[PDB]
Symmetry: D2
Subunit: 456 residues, 4 copies
Amino acid sequence: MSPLRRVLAELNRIPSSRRRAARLFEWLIAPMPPDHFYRRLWEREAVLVRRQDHTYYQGLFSTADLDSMLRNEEVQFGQHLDAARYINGRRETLNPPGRALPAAAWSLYQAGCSLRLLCPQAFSTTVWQFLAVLQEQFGSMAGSNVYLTPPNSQGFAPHYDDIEAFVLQLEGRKLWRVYRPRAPTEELALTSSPNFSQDDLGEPVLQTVLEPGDLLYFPRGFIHQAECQDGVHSLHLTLSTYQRNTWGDFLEAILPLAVQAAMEENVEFRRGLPRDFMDYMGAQHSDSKDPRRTAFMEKVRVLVARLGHFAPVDAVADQRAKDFIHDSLPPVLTDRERALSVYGLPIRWEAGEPVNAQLTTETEVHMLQDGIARLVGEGGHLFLYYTVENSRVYHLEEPKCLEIYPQQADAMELLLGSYPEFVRVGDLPCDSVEDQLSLATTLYDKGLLLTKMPLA
Amino acid sequence: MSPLRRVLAELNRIPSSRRRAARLFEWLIAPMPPDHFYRRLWEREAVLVRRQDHTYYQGLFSTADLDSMLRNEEVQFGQHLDAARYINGRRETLNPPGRALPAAAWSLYQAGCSLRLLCPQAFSTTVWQFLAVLQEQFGSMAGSNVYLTPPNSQGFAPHYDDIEAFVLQLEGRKLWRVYRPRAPTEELALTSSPNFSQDDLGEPVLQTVLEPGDLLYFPRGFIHQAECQDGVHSLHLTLSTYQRNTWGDFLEAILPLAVQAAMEENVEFRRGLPRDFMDYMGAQHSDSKDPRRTAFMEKVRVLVARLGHFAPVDAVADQRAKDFIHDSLPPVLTDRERALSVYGLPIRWEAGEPVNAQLTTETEVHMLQDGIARLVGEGGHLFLYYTVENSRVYHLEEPKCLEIYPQQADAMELLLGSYPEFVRVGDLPCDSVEDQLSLATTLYDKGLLLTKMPLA
Amino acid sequence: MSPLRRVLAELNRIPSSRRRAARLFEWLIAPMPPDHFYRRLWEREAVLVRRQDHTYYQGLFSTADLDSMLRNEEVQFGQHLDAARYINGRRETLNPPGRALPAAAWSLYQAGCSLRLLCPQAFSTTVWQFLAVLQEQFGSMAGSNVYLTPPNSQGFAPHYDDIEAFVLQLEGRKLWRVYRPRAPTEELALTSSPNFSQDDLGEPVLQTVLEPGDLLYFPRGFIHQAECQDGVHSLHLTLSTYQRNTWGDFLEAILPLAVQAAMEENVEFRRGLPRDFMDYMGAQHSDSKDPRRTAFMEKVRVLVARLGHFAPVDAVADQRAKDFIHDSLPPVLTDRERALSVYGLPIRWEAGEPVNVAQLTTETEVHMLQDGIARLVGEGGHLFLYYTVENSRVYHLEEPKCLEIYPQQADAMELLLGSYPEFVRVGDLPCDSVEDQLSLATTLYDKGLLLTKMPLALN
Amino acid sequence: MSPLRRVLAELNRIPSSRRRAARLFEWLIAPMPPDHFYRRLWEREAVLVRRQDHTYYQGLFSTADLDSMLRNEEVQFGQHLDAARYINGRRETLNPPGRALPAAAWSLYQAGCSLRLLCPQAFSTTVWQFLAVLQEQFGSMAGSNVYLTPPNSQGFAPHYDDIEAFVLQLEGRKLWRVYRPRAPTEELALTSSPNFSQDDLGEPVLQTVLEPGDLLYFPRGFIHQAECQDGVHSLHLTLSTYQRNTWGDFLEAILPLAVQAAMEENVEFRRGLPRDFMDYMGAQHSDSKDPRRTAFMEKVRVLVARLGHFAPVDAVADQRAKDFIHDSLPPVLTDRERALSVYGLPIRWEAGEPVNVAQLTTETEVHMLQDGIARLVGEGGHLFLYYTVENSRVYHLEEPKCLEIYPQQADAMELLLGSYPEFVRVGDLPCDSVEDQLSLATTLYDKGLLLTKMPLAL
Ligand SMILES: O=C(O)CNC(=O)C(=O)O
Ligand SMILES: O=C(O)CNC(=O)C(=O)O
Ligand SMILES: O=C(O)CNC(=O)C(=O)O
Ligand SMILES: O=C(O)CNC(=O)C(=O)O
Ligand SMILES: [Mn+2]
Ligand SMILES: [Mn+2]
Ligand SMILES: [Mn+2]
Ligand SMILES: [Mn+2]
């Protein structure tokens, strides 16, 4: 077994989804310690991990897998696959319209075009598990792109991305050039950059040839470009996460709610503006030393600083967790998780008819996995959003939730916060035995709960 | 000659529109001094002014004007005129569809229905001038409604408004009851309230019978109601201003831009959120004791406070100023202002053809009026927005502006700031004399500038 | 007094709105008989009427009025006034944004630009009455445009319009050239043409210099162009009507309704298409010799012909009447009509209080205010009376207006509509009772759609 | 083997997709002759075929397939599966929200709920093939629904559909009742009816118990209802076709085009209406004896009849063909078709590069992949070839797909579409240049619309 197949087999043996995610990330950057990586290198500098083992990723994704996909799946150009090339300093996109059959894709490849698969997790169960598990320790959606570049060519123009990137070299070799942010405003850039020319760049802070097994990481804002040497092609998978997951994004959501709450709860935010402020505020008064401006600006600073007191921080955290649920890949269940939940509940047939299975107050249970559900308050109501009905295709499924009544709130929170400890249904903090069985049965039937022993 | 006609005649002799505005407001609340009113009563207390002069408002509006309006104008029910009556603690609306002809209106009036004209200024040139001048010293759109209530009746249920109200008793008398905000949240209310019942009310802070010439002012949020006693009907005009012109409103517009600027200018606002903040933030963690929760809360509060430093106060002031220009009533020119502008340039048919002079570098000029234009910077471009082409009907006319080029900005701002001081064209700060003439000419032709002496 | 002022004064003394319309049109083309005009010249030939009377249109509109309007009204460039110039064979438009003040307009005029007023009826009460009266005999909206061209210039490039035009020369002179439709597809054109060049034209079927008082008429599809002589300016008003009022426009509305009816009422229109018609129908089979192709074609033709039986002709006629009412200018009342309608009913005042209270008795004589102000229309299974009395002089500013007519009143409503201008006594209205009999009459009177033989109150 | 598996094996050996479709329909209603069926029964009468063979449809769809689907596919309630029951004369729908897991579905079934699968063809390759082939001889979309009703119950209230229905009894038995259209307006109804009550129904024209292998056909407008007798459950597949495919539908699209063309080409349609027709036309005037009213009416009928001469029939036929291509299921290729097309072209990856990477020459012999996968359509002064090869098995999931055919290629395209399944040498295509012959053939082959007589990768 290769290291990748080995660790995946190991993951199936780890009862907690939280621990499985920590383990896979540990494996991803080994031998570098995760603690050291997040403390000093995450979002700060480019990092190269020389693996010394070309088989490290064997089983994750290969060119034969790409070929098999184009033939047996409905892979579309533009929607799923891009064909591009960077020749004569110009970025070209040769995307024919329609389905990307093997004959077409490979003809483009033989003509020097690079092929980029936009959603491999939708077509590969191994990439799916890989991302589903890693998204849990990033606390942010984890996507991927697969890049196949033919010998002696470059598929893309230098540029920097709007996400944190992990480059896994799968096949062949490729010369990579990584540059530090060119200016202060480019550090941890908010959006993807345009295509740059060789003249827009300076001296790379990291230039190296990657080999199968190696890993190259760099923060958003770091310009990069890669090319294949003589005779050897290159296949790599880029793992991306942390798209617009900043303090500023958190603030953009909290501010309108904070002002709204301040206006409704405090008369000072309700008082009228001065009748003559238009006489000293405005671009045509920017050079003015009018004492009225200073007082006006001083009031703006004081009111804005107040707003902190009215900021609904928990509500915004829940709104972001809800969007995370919506963006998430559905879970990959271990053999045990499937066997102990409604997914592995057998239906016995006799005489051509199904003959069904009930939880009791003695049944011990806990959440299917740690990152598949979230309690969210909306419009004075409580809703439990979940990922178990999500597609492997990004946003193909709309947000899924079920209403949690006030009486069940305490028990629901207990279940979400005590994973993976088993809890008897009869020990749930509800006002009646009937309420305990009701909540447990609802969660179990929806595939959100597992039992210590199979129900049947 | 009534006091009103007296002051209007007086305003026609005052050179500055700014002085005219201050003079008219002083007149409106005489003998109470403006300084005292704005400093202690405005947005704070209800105020009554026993004029002791039934002729104070003669010339402003009368029942004869209303009657004449229905006859000679296209007054429509719903859009222009409402009919209502308050019987048995229940608000009624008897609005027939279509035009409100005298016969139909007076018929409803006889049935005990009150009549409410929604936009008097569109039909009465005096009310128009009255509101066009006052809007200048309020620094906010000033509107009005005329109420005609038949004897022994009440047209409306008790309620509070979302604007500052000035009630001018025009004919007859009416028993008015004004109440202080019922609760902190209702003080300076953001929106109009629903219809209240006598039970939802306590003791009125002011109960009085108004008579012709009297003035009754009260802040948004003060519930009120009025009724006519046996034997005399009532006609009054309510002047309204300050609709959604609060600090909260200023903040709602400034914050989104502030965070955006903060994220682009300071890397701290671009840093990634913790990978695990969802483990301790959110409704399901409201009682968590994790110290990271407290640190997260404290960080949000400091980031919010710091946003004030990035708030584009001038840009937002210009946007509100631009909206004020759009919402403004067109200017009412004095006899001499008209005689000195393009609106007074003599032109006819002579010899069967147009008679058709031009302005030179020795011509003294200054803005037509003080509150008719505003320079706004949008998308790296100077725009001069104006009110001169506005309709007396609210928003009937779309926003109107004139693009200003860089080499003319200083000259424009100078003209806007030096009102009403005349300035010879040659003294304009411009690159070539062809620009001093170009600018002065364009402004004169649009009806935004006047000359020291008839240019013809 | 000018002929125009003299005919208008006369119209005020003509009680029937239908007869007034006929009289004004008669006056418009005098001495040519209306019967002859419609029977042989309407939609067929260009017609010139040499009035031999320069003061014929005096009072309708002048350059003085145009000046006054720009000075007192909110005239906007593009919206109400256009500034054009046709020089070097090219058509240019110099419409600056914003209000068109006298200073700007006249400056453009002095620069050789022709000025065109798009809606004179909204600003001139005389133009308004003229069009309000003529629309009734055209049975189609009547609009107008005013044109003022400076000496020695041409404001517009040759072209043809999508409406029937009547050119009234008001001031100065102008050389007109009218060409007969170039090709068969241009005869009675449906839409306006682009700007043509002198090269795309042939020989005029009528060339003449119009002078004040003259009338020039030409059908849609006839190309035309005009130029001003030396030292003399030109002012004329073009009366227009019949925009999209063709048999085809009628068909376009009736067809979708006919198929729907045929499909719900006759199973043959509900039967399935052949399973294999795609094998012989379509562009890739235009050369097929399969006999099923000919049979298919004949089948379509017979089914189309058969829709005629399911065509709701009356319903579509009411719908077109409804739209005409929506496009109509509000009526212009005679002294008498006003004096006998709600618009002339006085309100008595006592102690600064209206006490006028005068209802309609069962012995009142009444009839529709005018003959072309209302129309009964059935929709969604109900009856509605659409009217024009609340329309604005500005095209489509006012939305369609109507009041519901209940089944028990239909007969009485059709009686009044079809008996104008004959006075009918309320008590004789075929209603369900005397109550409903008085209800109808009062409602109609209140909306300003009915008049009484004697004023209900003397002012 | 089962009759079904035997006929499907037979179709894999039949060269023409057109013949394959005729053969399968013949099999579907055997022993009844198709000619007789379309001539006297189709859209006219309910038909019962007593097969006397319980294994006739063996292999098409079973309860086990349904169970396997619920467990291995993302079957959603509402979107993919319905759970209903007819109790006390009232129709009930017990569709919970979300995914339809086996546990949830079987519990409802146990509670007396019938289960209906809305798009079997998306989850079963056999049903897909069955419908893809039959749509070709219907000339209209062929859809299907699967109904599983538990013992002793009725799932749906009596009603009639807006499509032609073929009921295929798969497992168990079921008592069916079919009624003749109640009134003239309901004959060949255009839209589905609401739920009816037993009181609205008269006497059945057809009442019988269906057994595995039987076939029950009935036109749109025929009310029907069924229940499971005490004892066994029932599973059936209903094949539907001919939704809004009537002469009236053809007319609706052609009329506006006809008037537009008539007005543009004939002055009579451009002449003005009378200035006073409002005086004698309209509801108020329906009684009027005005002779002008008679003439007006006659002119409308005359102008309407003249419209036929201006009806663009081929243009409307192409638009409907275009919609048919859009609603079609993608083709199911025989082994030979796949092996002779781009789909079966060996270009597999090995040695670290693309191996076995075969071009068409003027010597190559070709013909359309199948007969019902493409259609030439004229739109806005241009020619487009619409095709079905990239359609999803899910209705309308994929947008309309086409490629532009330039005027210089029109003749060659029509030749290929019209000479199927005869082989034509690329060098013999009627084009203006040799390169044009190669260019068209290569483009069509690469899109999966053409096959070659011999594999290109020899
Ligand atoms: O591989 C290349 O040519 C470009 N790759 C990337 O931009 C990436 O992996 O994010
Ligand atoms: O006059 C009345 O009955 C009520 N008036 C008002 O609410 C007002 O003037 O704002
Ligand atoms: O008067 C002109 O120059 C042009 N006139 C017209 O096009 C017209 O009256 O319809
Ligand atoms: O099976 C049932 O109960 C009802 N079936 C149908 O309506 C059908 O197959 O079209
Ligand atoms: Mn990149
Ligand atoms: Mn109020
Ligand atoms: Mn014209
Ligand atoms: Mn059915």
